[PDB]
Structures are given as C-alpha cells and as structure tokens.
Amino acid sequence: RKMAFPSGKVEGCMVQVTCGTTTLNGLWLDDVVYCPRHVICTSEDMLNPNYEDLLIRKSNHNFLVQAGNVQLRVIGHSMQNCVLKLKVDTANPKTPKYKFVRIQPGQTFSVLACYNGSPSGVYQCAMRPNFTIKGSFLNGSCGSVGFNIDYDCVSFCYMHHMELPTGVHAGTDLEGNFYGPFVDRQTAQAAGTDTTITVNVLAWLYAAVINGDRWFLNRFTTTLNDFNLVAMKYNYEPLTQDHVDILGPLSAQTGIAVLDMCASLKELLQNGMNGRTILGSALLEDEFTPFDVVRQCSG
Amino acid sequence: GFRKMAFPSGKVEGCMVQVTCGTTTLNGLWLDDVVYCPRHVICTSEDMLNPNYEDLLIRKSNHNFLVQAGNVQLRVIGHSMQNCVLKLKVDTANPKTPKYKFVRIQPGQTFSVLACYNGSPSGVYQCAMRPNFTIKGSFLNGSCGSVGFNIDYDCVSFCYMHHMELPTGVHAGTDLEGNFYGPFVDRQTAQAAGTDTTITVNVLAWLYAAVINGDRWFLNRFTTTLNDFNLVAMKYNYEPLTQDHVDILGPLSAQTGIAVLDMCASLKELLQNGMNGRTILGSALLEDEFTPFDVVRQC
Numbered sequence: 190r191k192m193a194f195p196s197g198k199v200e201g202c203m204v205q206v207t208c209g210t211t212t213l214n215g216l217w218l219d220d221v222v223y224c225p226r227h228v229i230c231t232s233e234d235m236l237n238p239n240y241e242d243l244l245i246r247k248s249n250h251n252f253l254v255q256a257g258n259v260q261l262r263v264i265g266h267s268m269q270n271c272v273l274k275l276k277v278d279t280a281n282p283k284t285p286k287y288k289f290v291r292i293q294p295g296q297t298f299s300v301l302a303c304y305n306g307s308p309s310g311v312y313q314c315a316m317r318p319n320f321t322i323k324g325s326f327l328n329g330s331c332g333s334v335g336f337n338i339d340y341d342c343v344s345f346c347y348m349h350h351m352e353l354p355t356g357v358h359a360g361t362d363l364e365g366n367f368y369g370p371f372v373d374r375q376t377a378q379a380a381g382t383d384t385t386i387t388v389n390v391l392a393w394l395y396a397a398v399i400n401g402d403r404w405f406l407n408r409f410t411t412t413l414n415d416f417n418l419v420a421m422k423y424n425y426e427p428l429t430q431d432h433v434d435i436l437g438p439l440s441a442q443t444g445i446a447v448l449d450m451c452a453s454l455k456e457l458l459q460n461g462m463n464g465r466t467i468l469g470s471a472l473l474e475d476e477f478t479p480f481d482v483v484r485q486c487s488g
Numbered sequence: 489g490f491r492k493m494a495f496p497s498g499k500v501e502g503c504m505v506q507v508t509c510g511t512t513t514l515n516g517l518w519l520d521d522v523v524y525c526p527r528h529v530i531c532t533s534e535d536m537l538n539p540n541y542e543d544l545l546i547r548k549s550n551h552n553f554l555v556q557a558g559n560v561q562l563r564v565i566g567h568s569m570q571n572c573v574l575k576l577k578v579d580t581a582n583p584k585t586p587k588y589k590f591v592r593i594q595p596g597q598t599f600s601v602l603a604c605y606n607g608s609p610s611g612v613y614q615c616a617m618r619p620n621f622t623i624k625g626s627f628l629n630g631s632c633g634s635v636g637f638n639i640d641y642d643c644v645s646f647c648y649m650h651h652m653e654l655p656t657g658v659h660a661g662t663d664l665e666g667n668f669y670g671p672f673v674d675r676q677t678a679q680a681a682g683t684d685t686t687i688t689v690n691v692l693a694w695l696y697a698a699v700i701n702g703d704r705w706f707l708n709r710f711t712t713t714l715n716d717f718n719l720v721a722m723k724y725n726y727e728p729l730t731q732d733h734v735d736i737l738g739p740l741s742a743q744t745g746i747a748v749l750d751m752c753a754s755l756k757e758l759l760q761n762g763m764n765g766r767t768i769l770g771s772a773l774l775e776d777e778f779t780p781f782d783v784v785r786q787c
C-alpha cells in the first residue's frame with residue numbers, strides 16, 4: 190500500500206504568494222519563503238517570459254505573502270534558477286529540522302497538495318526515469334512540495350511547476366533546478382519515453398520473498414553488465430552501483446544475493462509470468478523503493 | 489491526474505500520545521483533557537486470551553496508566569470505559585485539540601488513517617470501510633489506537649480506532665464510542681469476517697475518474713436497466729446500486745456526458761469479459777476505495 194509521510198511538519202510551512210492576481214503556494218522556512226518564479230508572470234507573460242526583465246520591474250512591496258489572511262512583510266527578494274526566495278520579517282516558529290535534497294529517478298516522496306496556501310491532501314509519488322511524476326495537481330497547485338521525513342528531519346526534494354500534455358507533472362528541486370529537460374514557459378513540451386524502475390521492481394520481489402511468495406526464485410545468477418544489457422531491451426532501466434547498494438539490506442534479510450534476484454527478474458522478463466501472480470498481482474510494481482519496503486514491513 | 493489521496497494529517501498528529509499499562513503499550517487520542525484508547529491496553533498477554541474487561545478495569549488505579557505526550561508524562565486523574573474504548577481523564581488540556589466530531593461511518597465510505605507507534609505518527613493512507621466491516625489497512629504491532637478520520641473545513645470527524653488484525657491480514661476496530669464495526673470482539677482468538685463484496689458505486693466513480701483523465705477504452709455502446717445491472721452485480725459479489733447511488737454519481741455523469749446506466753453497462757462488460765490484459769488508471773483490477781465525493785473533490 191502507498192503510505193505517505195505524516196504531513197504536519199510541512200503543513201506548518203505552507204503559505205500563499207501573490208503577485209498581481211497570480212497566486213500560488215510558497216514554503217516558509219526560518220525567515221525565507223520559497224516559491225516558483227512564475228508567480229511574477231501574468232498569464233500572457235507565461236507564453237514567453239524574460240524572467241530577469243520581469244523581476245527587475247518588481248520590488249519587495251509588490252509581493253503579497255500570507256499565512257492564512259495574515260500578511261508577512263517581504264524585506265528582500267532574489268531569484269535562484271526557477272525559484273524565487275522572499276525574505277520576510279518573521280521567522281517561522283513551526284520551522285522543522287530540514288534539508289534540501291535533489292533526488293534520483295525511482296525515489297519516492299510524499300506530496301502535500303496545496304491551494305491558496307491551504308493543504309488539501311497528501312499522496313506518494315515516484316520520480317519517473319523521464320523526470321515526471323504522476324501527480325494530482327489542479328490550477329493553483331504550484332509551489333506544493335514533495336518531501337521525505339527521516340527521524341526529526343524533513344528532506345524537501347520537489348516543488349511543483351507544471352503539467353505536461355500527457356497529464357503528468359514536472360517541477361524543480363528547492364534550489365530551483367528542474368528535474369528533466371523542462372522549462373517554466375507555457376509552451377508545448379513533451380516528456381520522453383518512460384521506462385520501468387528496475388531497482389524498485391527488485392525491491393518488490395524482495396518484499397514478495399519476505400512474505401513467503403517465492404516461486405520465481407531461479408537457480409541462476411548473472412553479472413550486472415549482462416543484466417543491464419538484457420533489461421534495456423524490455424524498457425527497464427539499467428542498475429547503478431548505488432542501486433545495488435540500496436538493495437543490500439533486503440538482500441541480507443532474505444539471503445538472496447542482488448545478482449541472483451536480477452537473474453530471477455531476467456527470467457520473468459524473458460519468459461513471462463506464465464499465468465502466476467506475485468503478491469496477488471500479475472503486474473510487477475515499480476513505485477516502491479527498497480526503503481519503502483522496509484518502512485512498511487517495519488515501523 | 490488521479491491519485492489515492494489522504495487528508496493532511498497535522499491536526500491529528502497533534503493529538504497522538506502513548507499509553508502504557510504494564511508491559512502493554514499502544515497509542516491514545518488526546519482531545520481536551522481526555523485520552524481515548526483501546527481498552528485491551530489493560531490486559532496482560534494472558535488476559536487477552538479471554539478478558540472480562542469490567543473485572544480487569546475495576547482492579548486498576550489511575551497510576552497504573554502511564555500517558556506520555558512526547559517527552560512529557562501526563563497525570564491521569566480519572567478513568568472510565570465506554571464499550572471497547574478506555575477514557576483517561578488527565579490533568580492537562582491538549583492545546584492542539586482541533587475542532588472535532590465523533591461519527592460512525594457507513595460501509596463503502598472512505599477515511600484517512602494516521603498509523604502511529606509509541607504515540608508517534610509514522611504514515612498516512614486512505615482506507616474504505618468494507619461491506620463486511622473490515623478495513624484493508626497496514627497496521628503492525630503497536631499500532632492500536634491509531635485513528636481514522638475525515639476533515640471538512642476546520643473540523644476533524646474521527647470515525648475509526650484500530651484494535652486488531654484478522655488471520656486473513658485485514659483489520660478491525662471501533663468507532664470512538666468503542667463499538668466495533670462488524671461482528672468482531674476484542675479477544676485474542678481467530679476471527680473470520682463475512683464474505684466481502686465490492687463497493688459498486690465506488691467502482692463506477694473510479695471508472696468516471698478514468699474518463700476524466702482521458703481513458704475511455706472500457707466504454708461501450710450498450711446500456712442496461714438498473715435492475716438488470718444489479719442482477720449481474722450480485723452474481724459477481726458486487727453490492728447493489730441504489731437510486732441514491734445513481735443520484736450521487738450525477739455530477740460525474742454530467743461532467744463526462746456518460747449516463748450512469750451507460751457506465752453500468754460498461755462495468756457489466758468488464759465483469760463478464762475481464763480486462764483482457766489492459767489496465768485502468770494503472771490498475772489491473774477494478775478499484776473500489778474511491779467514493780464519488782473523493783473523485784469529485786480531486787477532479
């Protein structure tokens with residue numbers, strides 16, 4: 190089951206940011222509010238914005254930052270890649286311990302979908318290999334963030350900026366660098382062909398083994414290079430060394446070597462399921478990370 | 489986009505505490521100056537095999553209950569039992585108490601679960617009350633006292649408190665008056681549920697969601713009467729569709745231009761032919777834990 194992180198620590202950081210009649214969400218940490226820089230655009234500006242020129246025309250007093258109906262006075266501003274940073278005169282007393290991280294494809298995170306600075310729902314997303322996410326985002330959702338929580342610390346990894354023709358979503362890290370080859374312009378853009386997240390499928394197979402569903406374990410092994418070359422013919426991602434390493438704990442727990450599991454997956458790709466199921470499904474699941482399998486099979 | 493989405497959990501996170509009696513620890517819900525929790529906290533492992541709860545409870549004193557909110561012990565100054573829930577009066581009001589109600593939900597209705605361990609929130613997810621009054625949750629040892637809820641405006645409606653897992657892996661619990669959903673008892677003995685059925689009005693909502701998101705492969709030119717649909721639905725262990733259900737689906741029908749009974753004829757075809765390998769909103773199975781309201785809210 191997809192399980193999100195408890196959202197309270199992030200809810201306490203959500204604000205709204207308005208420039209003119211353009212409103213979206215911002216993230217208030219200490220005395221800085223982070224938000225998408227296209228808040229400075231009119232609808233017509235978005236077709237072909239010159240952000241440097243648009244921002245030179247702005248001053249601190251052109252930005253309306255609100256926590257609910259309570260205005261936070263803006264005392265400084267700057268642009269960092271595709272994010273605006275607004276210094277405000279109040280440090281957020283609900284600021285959690287936090288970090289800004291840039292995630293890899295395959296990593297999952299919780300999204301707190303917000304409208305007008307108000308949280309509406311929380312759900313789990315996986316960053317696809319084509320650097321899109323299958324979100325649920327409507328008009329006004331920009332500036333909603335994705336995050337993971339480890340012990341005390343919220344790791345912010347995603348800020349929402351746009352939807353693509355195919356219905357999927359694109360955005361940046363909290364330094365304003367897009368995931369993928371997208372730009373914050375209201376122009377026709379296309380997500381490239383997606384692929385299956387191999388490291389997560391392997392995590393799912395380990396989860397199946399942990400729960401006693403292990404008919405697919407075969408008697409073979411493989412090399413990582415051989416496996417990578419075969420898997421790409423099935424539109425699966427190649428594994429990295431870091432992938433092998435993050436499967437370590439599940440490999441240790443089950444006693445199944447990573448490359449033996451790779452050989453088992455290879456046989457599933459080459460010969461199919463043959464009518465059988467795994468964890469009550471004939472589809473291989475690729476949106477649970479090794480950490481997610483551990484998270485859920487533990488507490 | 490369309491995603492299984494939970495309510496933001498912050499208002500509930502600020503109510504979760506840890507309750508300890510003997511070697512038994514679970515979670516409580518702290519509202520104003522009362523902590524609510526499952527009464528089986530008062531049982532030893534031996535007591536749980538066949539507890540006479542009124543007899544066990546009369547023998548406890550206030551100081552037998554250790555309530556911890558974070559690193560802070562709250563002193564218990566009174567205790568009573570309401571059906572299967574224990575109410576501990578404490579000497580401190582929870583300053584984070586939200587506006588709240590206690591409600592008893594109907595089978596087929598959805599809610600969000602905040603899974604907690606040792607009074608600390610661990611994850612949030614969306615559940616439905618099944619027709620057989622189980623829930624397909626993700627609960628581990630120590631999760632008891634986790635609650636299910638819905639949020640409307642500023643108001644949290646608590647509808648579920650977690651008590652147990654069945655041999656089949658599904659879960660059972662009570663409302664906040666301590667009455668179980670279903671024919672279950674808080675005794676450590678193997679218990680089976682009634683035959684489950686599929687929540688038909690929810691499957692139809694999800695099929696409409698799939699259209700709203702541009703997928704209509706499963707539609708057809710046929711139609712059906714309500715009764716002839718219900719004959720087929722019951723044959724496949726689907727719940728009957730009422731005229732209230734038809735009405736409740738009106739907004740989705742209007743939006744998409746697909747009459748409710750036309751979508752019923754679509755579902756009838758899916759039930760009689762299967763999906764022939766295809767998928768809907770990424771699922772190889774018909775999903776029945778989105779209500780019409782859930783779909784509408786998110787679309």
Ligand SMILES: *[C@@H](O)[C@H](C[C@@H]1CCNC1=O)NC(=O)[C@H](CC(C)C)NC(=O)OC[C@H]1C[C@H]2C=CC[C@H](C2)C1
Binds near residue numbers: 235326329331350353
């Ligand atoms: C937040 O400002 C907003 C969120 C999106 C609106 C609908 N769903 C979203 O996720 N972002 C934008 O409106 C964005 C601003 C540009 C400056 C980057 N543009 C955008 O997302 O365009 C998508 C629109 C327009 C058509 C194109 C593709 C999808 C769909 C039709 C919605």
Ligand SMILES: *[C@@H](O)[C@H](C[C@@H]1CCNC1=O)NC(=O)[C@H](CC(C)C)NC(=O)OC[C@H]1C[C@H]2C=CC[C@H](C2)C1
Binds near residue numbers: 674
């Ligand atoms: C909370 O105290 C705890 C939560 C469950 C533990 C495992 N998953 C849960 O949801 N509740 C209990 O342990 C409960 C106490 C009784 C007094 C009502 N009993 C229970 O849930 O039994 C199920 C356990 C024990 C074995 C029997 C069948 C299923 C499985 C093995 C889990």
